[PDB]
């Protein structure tokens, strides 16, 4: 780990280190990975967790955290893969997408998002409820 | 502010080709076959 | 010595005092009239104190009783009642004027009736109140809280008994600045 | 007399756009030899591949879920960072204000140490000096030496003590004078807080702060002395005589022309007699205050 | 329960404003109507002129007249009331 | 080859329909069965509303929702794929 | 007349369907005239929207809503009816 | 001076010989060809 | 481009106002900030009487003098500017 | 007898509109007459600014005041009623 | 071949509308696609707050500001466009 | 704010009168009414009769008698009051 | 030419007062001195005692002794004169 990455991870870890003991609970491991700028899936998260808490203490130290971080860090998706992913829900490559189809896929396929997450997404993105979504801006806000 | 009632009326926006396509097509096929039929009939009559 | 319940002690214009006399002045139950055109009858005590006393500039003074209550060092210095003509009726334990003490000042005429301008109940500090108290405005509303010579930024409770609401908050140097209006 | 004319009102509110559609029909006619016949305004086509798009969209949804999880974590981190920086500002600025107030108290104590204006400040100084004496003599005793030079050290120490006590006395005189002047100003202020007697009192306060004035000139000085003399000449009893006398002495010895630096004691006496004139019931219908 | 996040009004006048706002919210649906009601009320009770502004999301800076400027939140909306 | 008897869709949608029909023709040997297969595959494949008719002799007049329709022949068999 | 091989509809609408089908098959030759007459008459009476496939060589798979479905033979023509 | 803020798919197909009664249609062809042969 | 919803004000002063407002929106990005900025700018620019309100969901009826009323839209925000 | 094609509106406003529209339908049958009737009725009932589109063959794209938007086929004529 | 059936609008803006309609028919065919494109263009080009209906059969009764209303049989598509 | 230009009575009665005048200015605006009310209240409280004059601009001599003849301001409304 | 608006006085004594006021204005510039002359002569002339005001602006409401109350106007400056 470089000095900058070590500092960044100490900052975030201490933000999530509820009591400063130098370890973090497995429950917020995903938050940290997300907090660090990585967009990992729930499957990888569950794998890493499983692949790390054999002792059963249910905590993670800086060394193991740094190993997990470097690993996950090696496989990071680019911006274009994401643009394409957005356009996959954009039936005709117009740059818009029906809100009902988007919501249905988001809540019915893959790693089903929660209703709270979909509501927050629609709210936080200031998208017109009865319009066409210029996914390029929504994506920029989310990028 | 100002209320205006606009209604599309009858006999307006009228085209001519697309209104005659179907009758044209049906009549052409029909007439072709009917002509052929009458040709056959008249041939037989001529034989008689 | 000039003492004994003398028939009168005469000076030029003097002091017109009748009552138990000793030490050449009023001492005992007696009434002293003095240059402020006013006569008060009390259980005098060298004017270093006074028992129950009624002070009143009467008819010539044109008033019934100016003050009634006990006196101590010719200041009432205890329970005393003052009645203006129609301005007010102050009943409270005040020493050396209404400088301290907890009492009621009805700031309105027609006090026996509800038409009275305004009552007051609480603590006084030098005319002002400066303390926690409570005043029924004589329309039903009541105020319960802290005062600092008025305009006191303190959490208080005002009771809209007519409406059925109560407003608790901060009279921030004014009658109102912030608070919460609620339904008791 | 006047009245208002009119007003206006506008209810700002959201206004979006929604679309409505209509049924669109098409006809297909099977073509067979016979009565059926048809104009050709048609097109031909090659199929191409067909959709297996479901697995693509499922993988896309998984990817986007990973992306949304990272973004949600990032947004929660940003809110945590915001609260963190808020609390850090809180703590740092609170400690800074506390340090500032402590430094202010320190400077106040240092100013107390420079001049002991308070009587308590003087009592503090006295007790501090006596503690100093005691500590000095305790060190000197625990020295336990110089059974013939002990007394010379003692004499030096006592001379120090005497010098310090005389300095304390000088400072006490100064403080008494300045407290006197301050309390005079305070009484003048009590003579200010619109009854006619009180208005005259405010005028006299203006007058007294004009009498105690430095940076005078001569024309302005003579003019203000004339003003104050006109003002004084209303009551005119006996103090006004001597105050005016000293004023006129100065006025003359100024008309003839003498260095105002040589007019120090005389200005003092004029100001004192004017304040004494002011400190009078009949001459200042307010002197009942004190 | 309710709130007043800023005020310049004499206590009884403030209680009157509050009761008026209640009776308006009771007898009104549209906003500009509620504003007109409340403003007409206060202007007729507390010596015209007044102005009222009622909304849900709006940032305000103004130069009011002393003891005639109140801001309070009730139910859904926030109401600003100030005399010319 | 291919004749488009009726269309109310984008060119891409019609191409997808033709491709779908040719893919279907290698699975279903009964025409109602081809219709069912196509309907399932376009149900998951496309916008949920659909209708499909396949045959060698039929003519219709349907009020159909705008922008989604195609009706075209492959070989001698017509395939109609549309959204209600 | 309507010989209903498979029907899901009410009596009156079925009776009007049989009368219109009989008149169209007896009086008219081509399919689309019958289809348009049927569609307009069933919008007029049955329900405002409908979808039909009439033919001689037509295979279809449909998701009809109950109280609206027909699949019947008349003469030598197959008539398929459903509302959408 | 002041500031403020705040639906089941059903598949139906037509089968051969349902609508088409072979005899009633093949009768006239027989009649025609035999008439031709006879008269001719 | 700013839309004037309503106004009683001379044209040049309205252009002045829209210009100053767009400038304020360039400079500040908190509602009340915009309000106070425009208020002060307008007061300095023309006359002391001013009253600027900025928001998104506010309906207000306010008595106004002549020549001193403007209600106009800047992007998403709504501005109300009058003379006190 | 009113298929609500697309509507963002309270059920009660829909019903009140339906009642007044029933009186309109009993009065007239021509679309322009229907629109005049409808807009006059909702001018009398509510704020005069309203917008109604009535007809057999039309598609719109409109700007409507929120929580006031309805589009339904009431018989053969379709009515779309919203308030500007 | 434009025939301006009924309009309250400046002549120059009418000619501009005819031009825009020409390239509109050039670009898209769908009715409501044309109307949405037209409304976006006339929000950009002309003044805002428009309502558009590019229909075949409809009767509407709308209320508009003066000198902003248009209904013209552009080609044989009747296009109506107006301002709030 | 208010200065007693001439006081020819007891400071008690002067306080009385000042408060009386505050009440007067409260109750009325036309100086005639204010003087009327003050004079009534005073000939009640202070032994009829007295006379009250009020104005912005006058000047006069009076050969008054003891315990009367106050002359003060309120704002700039000068008030003279003396018993014949 | 003295005009007498309000009168409770002997027209003879009214004329008296007018001529007195003429002499005083002839013999004064300061209205305190007009008062002086007027009062002194009108006491000697008009059966003492009396009372006077001469001013530009004042309103009054007075209860006087019968037959001795006059309020009149000398040109531009008004004058009241009466008895106890």
From TrEMBL, chain A:
Q: Write down the species.
A: Chlamydomonas reinhardtii (Chlamydomonas smithii)
InterPro entries reported in the protein's UniProt record: CALM/Myosin/TropC-like (IPR050230), EF-hand-dom_pair (IPR011992), EF_Hand_1_Ca_BS (IPR018247), EF_hand_dom (IPR002048)
Q: Mind telling me which PANTHER family this protein's record contains?
A: CALMODULIN LIKE 3 (PTHR23048:SF0), MYOSIN LIGHT CHAIN 1, 3 (PTHR23048)
Q: Which domain of life is it from?
A: Eukaryota
**This chain belongs to which protein, by name?**
Calmodulin
Q: What is the lineage of its organism?
A: Eukaryota, Viridiplantae, Chlorophyta, core chlorophytes, Chlorophyceae
What's one GO MF term for it?
calcium ion binding
What are the record keywords, sorted? Calcium, Repeat
Q: Which residues form the EF-hand domain?
A: 4-39, 40-75, 77-112, 113-143
Q: Which GO terms describe its cellular component?
A: cytoplasm
TrEMBL record, chain C:
Q: Where does it reside?
A: Cytoplasmic vesicle, Secretory vesicle, Acrosome
The answer, when asked if Repeat is one of the entry's keywords, is yes
User: Any idea which UniProt keywords this protein has?
Assistant: Cytoplasmic vesicle, Repeat
User: Under the cellular component aspect of Gene Ontology, which terms does the record hold?
Assistant: acrosomal vesicle; membrane
Which superkingdom is the protein from?
A: Eukaryota
Please describe what this protein does. Answer: Assembles a suppression complex (suppresome) by tethering SIRT1 and MDM2 to regulate composite modifications of p53/TP53. Confers both deacetylation-mediated functional inactivation, by SIRT1, and ubiquitination-dependent degradation, by MDM2, of p53/TP53, promoting a proliferative and cell survival behaviors. May play a role in the regulation of spermatogenesis.
- Kindly provide the name given to this protein in its UniProt entry: MORN repeat-containing protein 3
Q: Which classification does the entry list for the species?
A: Eukaryota, Viridiplantae, Chlorophyta, core chlorophytes, Chlorophyceae
Span of the entire protein shown here: 31 to 214 of 256
TrEMBL record, chain D:
Top-level taxon of the source organism: Eukaryota
Q: Which residues form the IQ motif and ubiquitin-like domain?
A: 177-290
Which protein are we looking at?
Answer: IQ motif and ubiquitin-like domain-containing protein
Automatic annotation (TrEMBL), chain H:
Report which superkingdom the organism of origin falls in: Eukaryota
Cellular compartment(s): Cytoplasm, Cytoskeleton, Flagellum axoneme
Family statement drawn from the similarity comment of this UniProt entry = Belongs to the flagellar radial spoke RSP3 family.
What name does this protein carry? Uncharacterized protein
Whole-protein coverage range:
116 to 172 of 516
